[PDB]
Write an enzyme that holds these catalytic residues in place. Structure first.
Site, mmCIF file in Angstrom:
data_model
loop_
_atom_site.group_PDB
_atom_site.id
_atom_site.type_symbol
_atom_site.label_atom_id
_atom_site.label_comp_id
_atom_site.label_asym_id
_atom_site.label_seq_id
_atom_site.Cartn_x
_atom_site.Cartn_y
_atom_site.Cartn_z
ATOM 1 C CB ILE A 60 -0.749 0.261 0.716
ATOM 2 C CG1 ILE A 60 -2.213 -1.421 1.190
ATOM 3 C CG2 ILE A 60 -2.085 1.127 1.374
ATOM 4 C CD1 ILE A 60 -3.269 -1.449 2.853
ATOM 5 C CB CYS A 61 1.630 3.865 -2.595
ATOM 6 S SG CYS A 61 3.055 4.879 -2.548
#
Ligand SMILES: *OP(=O)(O)OC[C@H]1O[C@@H](n2cnc3c(N)ncnc32)[C@H](O)[C@@H]1O
Lengths: 989, 152, 82
Positions: free
Chosen positions: B84-85
């Protein structure tokens, strides 16, 4: 490059070539002075082998300059080194730009200084007597420096300028607004539009509220088109240096406080008293002679006080104790003091030659008199300091034969055989640290000498490339001192080798000297030294900066590493924002490095072996990777092996990466269609991408194209001609090779929307067979990155790519200084600051070896040679933490025996509670948890009857290997703070 | 040390976990990696639950931890491998003084309200802009085929 | 003394330039460290600042080092090269 051009052809004179003069000459040769002329008529004696590394025992009764020149010419074969056999002459000085008088007599100093002042030749009077070192500079009545400070020119991105008489413009957000000050001289070295303002004459700048930069009259110029880059221009400053005879009566001393100024004035008075004593009696004072010291201090007493700063009232009467102490030890010359003062003097010579950096304001007085025995201990005696033919005669005269023997019976560990490591090894060899059977020395380093390293290393030669760095350093140290027993090691000092450097190894050493290139390694070595309670000598350099610190257990504070920098040294990057909108040169350089790593390094092994039996496009992001990697050159039915410098192939990479890719991004994401959060609020936030067409008038685009072609030819193992020749005319003659091939080279061959498998079932078969054909080809090795081989053309390609992509995305171009920060073409340490930090480390070694010393005796150091900054301050006391009944420092540890039967975890908890009065809530061994007060009662009651060694064997799966006499594990206690840390628990197995 | 602070944060979190976290457990052999069950509270994601895995770098908290979903999901804001960014764990916005509870709250409000921050896969963004209903079908099918049932 | 009025001091950046700051004698050194960290864009643990040649401890107040208005303070960044 232009700065060193003056150095490349300059000619300098070094006189009084003693140890100090040898250090100055070595530093000048390493830095690349065009012509070094030595001058020394005196013959070599014992009393100067303790500090001069160029003279061995075989050079006794031989002229110092003649013997030194043989090695000096060998240090750098591009430097012409000659020796002046006769006496100095006034007409000889005409051919010299700088002269250095190292340890010369006062009358000779005055004569040569006056002669150079008349002829406008820079003059230096570096001198080291005892533990104090005097330096003098005189660059002339009118000297102009082109770089007053060590900083690259400021660069800012202007977003809009006004075509008005006041000329108030606007610039993008950044600290440059707080950096650009009113009255600065700036030049618009690059701008889209304003052809009159592009590369215009230098102009002033004024700043007001809200960063309103007022430039001046620009109404007559063209209309504003686009933003550009504004560059600062430093204004040269003229410096006036008084003549030596006049400056001696008005000493202007560089210092950091009034107390330091007074101390340096006292040192200047002591130096003048020593010079007058030498002139009157014909000999320097005898080593630690009481009557000679009394004569010197009495001479200083009749030396009238107003001889310094007549306009300034006498701040206080001269300290007789300081002058006496200087006189007592003045009979000897020391390797650390020589290294430090020669480093500073060579830096001043470089300032005079290249006109860079602010020159020293006449006088400087380095003091190191804290290395003597404590005021309550015994002082050295003339019997102890009597000469006896030893090569360390001067050091013995300063300290005594007993201290020399104490140094001999020492074993030390040197980590890192770099520039600081080589200089530390030289200092150890000259001092005599472990120069006997009872002592020794250890060198630890992992790298191998390369072509880019030895160019400025002192101990390396042209035939040492490829050999282990530690082994070559050990051989050089043994050459500098036959009595030294140096054991090189290729095993690095990291967590992956604790067994090699366990308790058995670290019980041998008496101290550790660290010269490392990273903060992580420094932190690890400091942790090891704290664990084994071994004194640590740490130093580091960067440009002209320099630090040298000593960490004595239970005396000084432990090495507080900058954990942020240690983490940032090797960290993953969230390329999401970098891929979407770059904003810094770091972003684009990381993009280029990642692109190289994936396309050329990682792709070789993944596409050949991994894809044969593992995941594929069905559950991976290859649908876009293939479209990015395949049409770079073309379909061609096969991967070509032909000559790569043709127009079509060279331009294709630039078109796809910077023209067609950016065009596709703009059409897919127009500046008015940026969906920041669903429908545009401020579309194109603070930036707007812009595709660029290959214009032949832009040299950078053609340079990038030719660099890409050369890089592809080099990586493919194919020959490449010099396309920079008349072939550039052919390249410019036909800027449009195939205008009709626009459609195939944009995206796949006919796809615009993909949809639900519109390409057809046979398309995937064609792609699969094309991939199978492309699999057969040259065996592209995932070779290690070439850190020093700049001739591979990788560096030019990546620099051009970054500098073009940043400008394409609206970011100002990156300069060479910022790009030099990366590992590629990393700037080597300047010889001057390296020698200075090595000398400071030797000065601290003189006290570490001296046994039990108070904290008020040790002294950390930090230096910046460009602005003549140098400080010696005592380090802080250890941080005393407290918790209820318990009170500890950073060096304290909890040693607990396991007993003849291994005490169980419950027994350990009971022992802790009963002995130290605290109850543990959390206790873990490094990374595996052993006990927790918050655990369930059944799990806790299961763990309690288990012995600690049995528990760690059960959890980690590794039995205690031989040499694990103690076990280290972390513990916390109830009622503690979240941030406080308890001492580590040493479990005696 | 990072390990002690990670252990203390895990203990404090488990002494009072948020309602959207179940069976949060860590391997005692390697305490720098966690397993947890996330309970989204917004439909149609709230239908099932996801097991997320968060790994702590050795230089914690001076380096943000990486969070990876064990179960594959079809989201524009989630990487194919499960990464996840997250804005908080971004290096340009990371702060060592922050706590993992804040990161968990941010991830919970992100999964309860999906947001198009960066199109990690451009085809995902194109299909979400052209036909969101097919994306909804794919996401629900992924949850039903790879997710775990919601416990109590 | 209460020293309610703040004074202006100069902190010297490593790259030659300098900037002015408004601080109190009761203000802690760590507060000055975080101010110069925010202005210079470098984390406060990576460097330390010194006055009249001697370093400043974070816990200690500014008043103990005898700072005067328009004084100069140099920031020394820790060095890695070796
Ligand atoms: O780049 P440099 O010349 O400044 O570095 C000096 C030497 O240090 C070696 N090095 C780096 N880290 C270690 C450790 N942890 N142990 C032993 N040697 C180490 C480099 O190889 C370099 O030559």
């Amino acid at each position: 490059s232009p700065a060193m051009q003056r150095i490349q052809g300059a000619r300098v004179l070094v006189s009084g070539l003693q140890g100090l003069g040898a250090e100055v000459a070595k530093n000048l040769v390493l830095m690349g002075v065009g012509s070094l002329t030595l001058h020394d008529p005196h013959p070599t004696c014992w009393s100067d082998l303790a500090a001069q590394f160029l003279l061995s025992e075989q050079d006794l009764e031989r002229s110092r300059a003649e013997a030194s020149q043989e090695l000096l010419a060998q240090l750098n074969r591009a430097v012409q080194v000659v020796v002046h056999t006769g006496d100095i002459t006034e007409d000889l000085l005409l051919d010299f730009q700088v002269v250095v008088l190292t340890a010369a007599k006062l009358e000779e100093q005055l004569k040569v200084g006056t002669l150079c002042h008349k002829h406008g030749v820079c003059f230096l009077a570096a001198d080291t007597r005892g533990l104090v070192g005097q330096l003098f500079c005189d660059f002339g009545e009118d000297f102009t420096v082109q770089d007053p400070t060590e900083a690259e020119p400021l660069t800012a991105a202007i977003q809009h300028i006004s075509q008005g008489s006041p000329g108030i413009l606007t610039l993008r957000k950044g600290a440059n607004t707080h950096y650009f000050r009113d009255g600065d001289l700036v030049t618009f070295s690059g701008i889209e539009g304003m052809v009159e303002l592009n590369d215009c004459d230098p102009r002033s700048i004024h700043v007001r509220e809200d960063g309103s930069l007022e430039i001046g009259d620009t109404t007559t110029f063209s209309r504003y088109l686009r933003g550009g880059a504004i560059t600062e221009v430093k204004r040269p400053k003229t410096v006036r240096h008084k003549s030596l005879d006049t400056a001696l009566l008005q000493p202007h001393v560089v210092a950091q406080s009034s107390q330091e100024v007074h101390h340096a004035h006292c040192l200047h008075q002591a130096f003048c008293a020593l010079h007058k004593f030498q002139h009157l009696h014909g000999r320097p004072p005898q080593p630690w002679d009481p009557v000679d010291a009394e004569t010197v201090v009495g001479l200083a007493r009749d030396l009238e006080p107003l001889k310094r700063t007549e306009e300034e009232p006498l701040e206080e009467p001269l300290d007789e104790a300081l002058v006496r102490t200087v006189a007592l030890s003045s009979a000897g010359v020391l390797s650390p003091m020589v290294a430090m003062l020669g480093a500073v003097a060579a830096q001043e010579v470089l300032k005079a030659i290249s006109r860079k950096f602010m020159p020293l304001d006449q006088w400087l007085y380095f003091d190191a008199l804290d290395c003597l025995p404590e005021d309550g201990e015994l002082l050295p005696s003339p019997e102890d300091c009597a000469l006896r033919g030893s090569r360390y005669d001067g050091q013995i005269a300063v300290f005594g034969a007993g201290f020399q023997e104490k140094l001999r019976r020492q074993h030390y560990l040197l980590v890192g055989a770099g520039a600081i490591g080589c200089e530390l090894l030289k200092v150890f060899a000259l001092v005599g640290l472990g120069a006997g059977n009872s002592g020794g020395l250890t060198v630890v380093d992992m790298d191998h000498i390369e072509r880019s390293n030895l160019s400025r290393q002192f101990l390396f030669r042209s035939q040492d490339v490829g050999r282990p760095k530690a082994e070559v350093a050990a051989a050089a140290a043994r050459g500098l001192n036959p009595d030294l027993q140096v054991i090189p090691l290729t095993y690095p000092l990291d967590p992956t080798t604790e067994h090699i450097y366990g308790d058995n190894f670290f019980s041998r050493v008496d101290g550790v000297a660290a010269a490392l290139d990273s903060f992580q390694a420094r932190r690890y070595v400091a942790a090891r030294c704290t664990h084994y309670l071994k004194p640590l000598l740490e130093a580091g350099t960067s440009g002209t900066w320099g630090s040298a610190t000593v960490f004595m257990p239970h005396v000084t504070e432990a090495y507080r590493a900058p954990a942020s920098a240690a983490a940032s040294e090797d960290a993953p990057y969230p390329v999401c924002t970098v891929r979407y909108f770059p904003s810094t040169a770091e972003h684009t350089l990381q993009w280029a490095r990642h692109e190289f790593e994936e396309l050329f390094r990682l792709s070789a092994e993944t596409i050949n072996h991994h894809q044969q039996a593992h995941t594929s496009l069905a559950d991976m992001d290859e649908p876009q990777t293939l479209t990015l990697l395949k049409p770079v050159l073309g379909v061609l039915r096969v991967r070509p092996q032909n000559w790569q410098d043709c127009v079509a192939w060279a331009l294709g990479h630039w078109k796809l990466c910077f023209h067609y890719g950016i065009k596709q991004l703009l059409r897919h994401f127009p500046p008015n269609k940026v969906l920041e959060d669903g429908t545009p609020f401020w579309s194109g936030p603070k930036q707007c991408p812009q595709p660029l067409e290959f214009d032949t008038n832009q040299d950078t685009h053609l340079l990038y194209v030719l660099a890409a072609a050369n890089l592809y030819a080099q990586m493919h193992g194919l020959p490449g001609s010099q396309d920079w020749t008349a072939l550039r005319e052919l390249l410019k003659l036909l800027p449009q090779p195939d205008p009709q091939q626009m459609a195939p080279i944009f995206a796949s061959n006919l796809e615009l929307a993909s949809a639900s498998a519109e390409f057809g079932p046979e398309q995937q078969k064609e792609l699969n067979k094309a991939l199978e054909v492309w699999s057969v080809g040259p065996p592209l090795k995932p070779l290690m990155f070439e850190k020093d081989d700049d001739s591979n053309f990788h560096v030019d390609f990546v620099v051009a790519a970054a500098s073009l992509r940043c400008q394409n995305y609206g970011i100002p171009p990156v300069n060479r200084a910022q790009s030099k920060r990366i590992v590629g073409q990393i700037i080597p340490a300047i010889a001057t600051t390296t020698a200075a930090v090595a000398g400071l480390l030797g000065l601290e070694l003189y006290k570490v070896v001296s046994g039990p010393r108070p904290r008020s005796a040790f002294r950390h150091s930090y230096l910046h040679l460009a602005e003549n900054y140098l400080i010696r301050y005592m380090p802080f006391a250890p941080a005393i933490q407290t918790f209820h009944h318990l009170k500890w420092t950073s060096w304290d540890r909890l040693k607990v025996p396991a007993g003849q039967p291994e005490r169980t975890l419950e027994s350990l908890l009971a022992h802790l509670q009963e002995q130290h009065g605290l109850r543990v809530r959390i206790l873990l061994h490094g990374s595996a948890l052993l006990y927790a007060a918050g655990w369930s009662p059944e799990k806790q009651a299961q763990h309690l009857p288990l012995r600690v060694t049995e528990l760690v064997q059960q959890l980690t799966g590794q039995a205690p290997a031989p040499g694990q006499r103690v076990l280290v594990l972390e513990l916390s206690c109830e009622g503690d703070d979240e941030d406080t840390a308890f001492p580590p628990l040493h479990y005696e197995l | 040390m990072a390990s002690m602070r990670v252990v203390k944060e895990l203990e404090d979190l488990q002494k009072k976990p948020p309602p959207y976290l179940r069976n949060l457990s860590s391997d005692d052999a390697n305490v720098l990696v966690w397993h947890a069950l996330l309970l989204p509270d917004q439909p149609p994601y709230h239908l099932k639950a996801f097991n997320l895995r968060i790994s702590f770098p050795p230089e914690y908290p001076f380096k943000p931890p990486m969070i990876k979903f064990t179960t594959k999901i079809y989201h524009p804001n989630v990487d194919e491998n499960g990464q996840i960014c997250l804005p908080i764990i971004s290096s340009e916005n990371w702060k060592p003084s922050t706590k993992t509870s804040q990161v968990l709250e941010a991830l919970n409000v992100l999964v309860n309200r999906p947001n198009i921050r960066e199109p990690k896969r451009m085809d995902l963004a194109d299909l979400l802009t052209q036909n969101p209903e097919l994306f909804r079908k794919n996401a629900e099918e992924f949850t039903l085929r790879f997710g775990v049932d919601r416990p109590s | 003394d209460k020293s309610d009025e703040p004074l202006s001091i100069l902190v010297r950046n490593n790259k030659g330039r300098s900037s002015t700051y408004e601080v109190r004698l009761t203000q802690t050194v760590a507060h000055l460290k975080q101010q110069v960290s925010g202005l210079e864009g470098v984390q406060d643990d990576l460097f330390w600042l010194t006055f009249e040649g001697k370093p400043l401890e974070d816990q200690l107040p500014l008043g103990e080092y005898g700072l005067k208005p328009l004084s100069t303070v140099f920031m020394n960044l820790r060095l890695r090269g070796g």
